[PDB]
């Protein structure tokens, strides 16, 4: 009773904290709030996954209904057993082939997503969309437009995007000062296919561990 | 039954290994375990013991070791205060 009503306000607790935004309303009933704020707000600690205080047993997810059953890592998919055995609604293969897939072909191979120091998987999360996202931030760059989005845009080949004219009056993108586009800052004769422009960088090892040779263990 | 066994193993592991936070443990009880284990390792490794000896600048190293031993008990602060 008295101890329950003795609690300091969470904002009174914020001042003790160097990173006050992590502390939350429920920290008021922390039996040792001044300590718990220091631990929770300590540098490298990773806050408890928030699926607690929910009674849903951490997975009720509607998204769980729409998750793909599985996908082979493409290196293993090269092994062709996908066609040999149909998992969807004998199969002998070469020892050298399989062994080389894991070792010769797949030594340097690593899953593309993984996760980071403090990455924690909440129920509603799905990594796959973020994998295509990270891969997409990689492939796609300004000045280039795929033929699909080009067809939807109804832009014929050899013709500049509609924002090149408004970009002539307004100016180059503030975010891309080094961006070049045919007809304006960049040679129109170099206009080719899906690329109407490219960023021209103005910036222009061994890491003590350079192996200088790569030799995998041989099965034979 | 299973959880009930985990209670008994909680009593046994707590007996052997001393401080193990069960569910509710006061910060005074637990921080004492922290201090005791940290000092325990500082004096336990001849390495870190040699290190604290020099950085502290004591005349002998066993002064630092038995210092840590004494520093394990809470009343040693007031003991230093009474010197």
């Amino acid at each position: 009773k008295r101890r329950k009503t003795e609690k300091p306000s969470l904002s009174q607790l914020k001042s003790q904290v160097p990173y006050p935004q992590i502390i939350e309303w429920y920290d008021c009933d922390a039996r040792y709030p001044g300590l718990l704020a220091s631990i929770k707000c300590t540098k490298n600690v990773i806050p408890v996954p928030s699926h607690w205080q929910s009674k849903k047993e951490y997975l009720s997810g509607r998204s769980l209904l729409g998750k793909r059953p599985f996908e082979l890592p493409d290196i293993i998919k090269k092994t062709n057993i996908e066609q040999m055995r149909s998992t969807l609604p004998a199969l002998d293969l070469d020892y050298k082939k399989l062994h080389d897939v894991f070792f010769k072909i797949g030594a340097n191979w690593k899953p593309d997503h993984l996760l980071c120091f403090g990455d924690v998987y909440y129920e509603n999360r799905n990594l796959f969309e973020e994998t295509n996202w990270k891969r997409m931030v990689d492939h796609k760059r300004p000045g280039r437009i795929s033929q699909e989005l080009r067809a939807i845009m109804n832009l014929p080949e050899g013709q500049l995007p509609p924002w090149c004219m408004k970009m002539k009056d307004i100016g180059l993108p503030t975010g891309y000062p080094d961006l070049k586009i045919a007809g304006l800052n960049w040679d129109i004769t170099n206009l080719k296919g899906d690329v109407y422009g490219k960023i021209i960088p103005n910036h222009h090892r061994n890491y003590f561990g350079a192996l200088i040779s790569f030799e995998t263990p041989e099965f034979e | 039954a299973e959880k009930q066994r985990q209670l008994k193993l909680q009593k046994i592991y707590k007996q052997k290994y001393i401080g193990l936070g069960d569910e509710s443990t006061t910060r005074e009880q637990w921080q004492r375990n922290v201090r005791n284990d940290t000092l325990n390792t500082l004096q336990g490794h001849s390495a870190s013991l040699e290190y604290v000896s020099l950085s502290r600048g004591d005349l002998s190293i066993r002064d630092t070791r038995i210092h840590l031993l004494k520093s394990m008990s809470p009343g040693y602060k007031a003991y230093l205060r009474e010197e």
């Binding site: 306000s9 969470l10 904002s11 009174q12 914020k14 001042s15 006050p20 935004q21 502390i23 939350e24 309303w25 | -």
Partner: protein, 80 residues
């Protein structure tokens, strides 16, 4: 902080933290927006919280300017 307003649910009040009017009360109050102030209730405490939110030596020629500030020695550049 909001008109001593009443809320019928804790999820809803937890949604009040990101809102137009709630941020208008904060920012117009002088307590700037977003995520540090989320747990606010009363107007008073976040004022001291916002108060919680908000020596170089350029060597003059007499060799006493080792205490002298950068901008000060630039002012003595404009004076010199």
């Amino acid at each position: 902080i909001c008109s001593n307003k009443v809320y019928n649910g804790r999820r809803t009040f937890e949604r009040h933290f990101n809102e137009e009017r709630h941020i208008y009360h904060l920012r117009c109050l002088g307590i700037e927006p977003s995520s540090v102030f989320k747990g606010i209730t009363k107007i008073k405490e976040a004022q001291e919280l916002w108060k919680n939110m908000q020596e170089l030596e350029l060597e003059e020629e007499d060799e006493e300017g080792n205490v002298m500030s950068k901008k000060v020695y630039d002012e003595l550049k404009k004076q010199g």
